[PDB]
Amino acid sequence: MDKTTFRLLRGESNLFYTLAKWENNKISVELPENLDMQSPTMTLIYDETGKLLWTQRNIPWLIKSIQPEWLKTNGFHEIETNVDATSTLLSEDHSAQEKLKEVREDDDDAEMTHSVAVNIYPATARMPQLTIVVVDTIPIELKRSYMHHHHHH
């Protein structure tokens, strides 16, 4: 797979693991000091059952896109969606919203694909088994600023 993607999603998953606390049979997440940019990712936290315990943003369509089968192993997946749903996942002021505006006019039946990483953190003395799902919010279709063209001379 793409290496930058692996670094970003796994890194974010691990980071959330370090910020999660378990108190009163409930998960909370610390907002850390000195965090310099907002990651273009959305994190979900599940227990061993598949019950959603913590969700970073309430996107009801995306939570349903996450298949129960995915939650049982460490792996990578993709969710195919449309341009109106991808604009949901990004802040209204993020500069990819303008890229999505230009996709809408060129072809509003344009499909967008989001990477999804699942990682399982085994139960430890003061924390149960946490399954963390991180979604990349910028679709693969818009990663690049240009497309190579094959010229022969």
Q: Exposed, middle or buried: residue 125 (CB in 10 Å: 0-12, 13-18, 19+)?
A: exposed
Q: Exposed, middle or buried: residue 110 (CB in 10 Å: 0-12, 13-18, 19+)?
A: middle
- Cα Rg, the chain, nearest whole Å: 17
108 assigned to a ligand binding site: yes
Tokens of 25: 């049979």
For residues 6 and 117, give the distance between their C-alpha atoms in angstroms, rounded to a whole number.
8
Question: Residue 132 binds what, of a copy of itself, Ca ion, none (CB under 5 to 8 Å, by partner type)?
Answer: none
Question: Residue 79 binds what, of a copy of itself, Ca ion, none (CB under 5 to 8 Å, by partner type)?
Answer: Ca ion
DSSP classification of residue 119: E
Q: Which of 2, 18, 49, 50 binds a copy of itself (CB under 8 A)?
A: 18
Among residue numbers 38 through 57, which ones bind a copy of itself (CB under 8 A)? none
Q: In terms of CB distance, is 62 or 121 closer to a copy of itself?
A: 121
Q: In terms of CB distance, is 6 or 97 closer to a copy of itself?
A: 6
C-alpha distances (whole Å) from 48 to each of 53, 58, 120 are 10, 21, 9
Q: In terms of CB distance, is 8 or 90 closer to a copy of itself?
A: 8
Q: In terms of CB distance, is 97 or 124 closer to a copy of itself?
A: 124
Tell me if 67 contacts a copy of itself by CB under 8 A.
no
**Chain residues in the site for a copy of itself (CB under 8 A):** 6-8, 10-12, 14-15, 17-18, 32, 35-37, 109, 121-126, 147
- Residue numbers in the known binding site for a divalent metal cation are 108-109
